[PDB]
Each structure stands twice: as structure tokens, then as C-alpha cells.
Design a protein around this ligand. Sequence first.
Ligand SMILES: [Ca+2]
Lengths: 7, 305
Amino acid sequence: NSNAIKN
Amino acid sequence: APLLLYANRRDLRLVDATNGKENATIVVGGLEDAAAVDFVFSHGLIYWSDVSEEAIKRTEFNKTESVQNVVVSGLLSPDGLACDWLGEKLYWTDSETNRIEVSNLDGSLRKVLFWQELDQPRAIALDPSSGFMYWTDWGEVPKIERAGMDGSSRFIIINSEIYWPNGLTLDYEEQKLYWADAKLNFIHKSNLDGTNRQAVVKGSLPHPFALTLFEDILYWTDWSTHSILACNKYTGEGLREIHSDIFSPMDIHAFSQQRQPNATNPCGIDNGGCSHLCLMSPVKPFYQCACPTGVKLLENGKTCK
Ligand SMILES: [Ca+2]
């Protein structure tokens, strides 16, 4: 999991 | 069960919580990366942020065919927003410029409220009648904070047992704050000052993003399940999936006039006698005059230089 909106 | 308004990157959608098996209706389409979403029910407005177009836009959902209107532009990463339906203001967070800002509903009179000690500000919730705003920050020092909607009296209300506070909502009837943590996999609640904290859903939430509430039911989007979930706001029981197979669920709200309870605007018809912005305030007389960024308020507390 990454929690950033953009990625 | 209310209607649920949610952003979906490529569009904004509306699904009936009592009938979530059906396909959601598309309220707005042709978006790039719609993330945050909110509304002003009485004005027939829906607002959203797009992190690719670096903007906040709005549409009039009571017009047969109303166009997308850019309200605020040049927002590097507008990860959260909230509509002040009482004072008629727009609040947002930017996780790249590390700021919290306010403007009028049309984007005029922009004013930066906080620009320090913000790392990954995300969710923002408003209690206009009490003049308080609440936000999460999932950065190096994760926290939940609150402050006057006029930028006054900032302070941290939660700073322990917290890592990825993504979702945040208010229960206006019970006077409680709810939030979802995506790293610790839970939903907790507390009083509005952060005291009397307790667990709602103890664990087992894969990656909750945004949280809303209606009557006795909590609703949230989950990035990993690509769905909207629900449970009882008191016990966390009755955990269930409402609406599934969502492309990329983002921010979410219970879409109802009841979630924006009518109240007297302390600004009156006078704009509080403020030359520019009349912001909600937590202390009597419950409004506070303010000016655009960099502009000074004169000695009378009403008139901008
Ligand atoms: Ca940052």
C-alpha cells in the first residue's frame, strides 16, 4: 500500500 | 439510508445506500483525477478537487445542463476540501504546498489560513455553527487538529495511536468526531476536543480513505476493496459492503440537506460589516472579518487596508 493520492 | 456522493477520479457518482447493488448514477463525468468532493445543498452546488488539473471546480446539480466551472486553480495537490454552507466559504488542504486555505464559494478573496507545521494534510471537516474546522495530517508527525474557521486557536487534538488518518467526519447530533486510519486499520471516535476517545471498528479495514455519516450509520470508501462499506456508528456492528466494483473510490459524503442543518449566519445580511471575508469563528460574536492573503485588517477589525 501507498497512501499518496497521485502515485 | 441516504444518497452517497463520491469522487471516482474519472467522475463523480451518486448511489442510493439502501440500494447499492445497482449502478451509481454519474453526476459529473470526463474528469482526470477527481479526489475530494463536497456540496452546498441549499445552493444546488457540488464541488470537487482534481489533483491532475490542479483545481477545485463546481457544478450546479439543479440545472438540466450546467457546465464545469473552475473555482480555484494552481493547486498542486488539493487532497481535501470542505464547503462551509453557513458562512458560504470553501476550505481546502494542499499536501504539496503544505497549506490550508479558504475562499468564497466563487473562489474570490483567497486567504491562506495555515502554512506551517503541515506535512501531509488530507481530510478536512467543518462545524460551521460552532465555528470550528478539523483536519488530518498523515505526514512524519501524524495528527488530527482543530482550529477556528477563522484561523484562530489551532491545536492538536489527537497525536497518539495514529499513522494514516485518511477519513474524518462529524456527528452534529451527538457532538462527536470520527476518523479512519488506513495504516492501523481502524475507525475511532472522540469528543470534539479529542477527549473520551474510543474504538468503533477495532481493526480489519484494509485501506479506508474517506468517511461520512448519516443517522446511526458510518459509511466509508476503501482503496483496496474498491468499495463503500458501512457499520453502526455506536458499536461498529453490522459491518457490510454497500456498493462494490468501484473504479477508484475517493472522497465521500452523505448527500442530504439534513447533513447541512440550517442555522443563523452570525454575519447576518451585513457580511458582518466585513469589507471582504466574513468567516465563522468559535468565539462570540461567532464571526470574524478577514482579508485576502497578505492583506492587513484595519484597527476596526472589519475593514481591509
Ligand atoms: Ca509535503
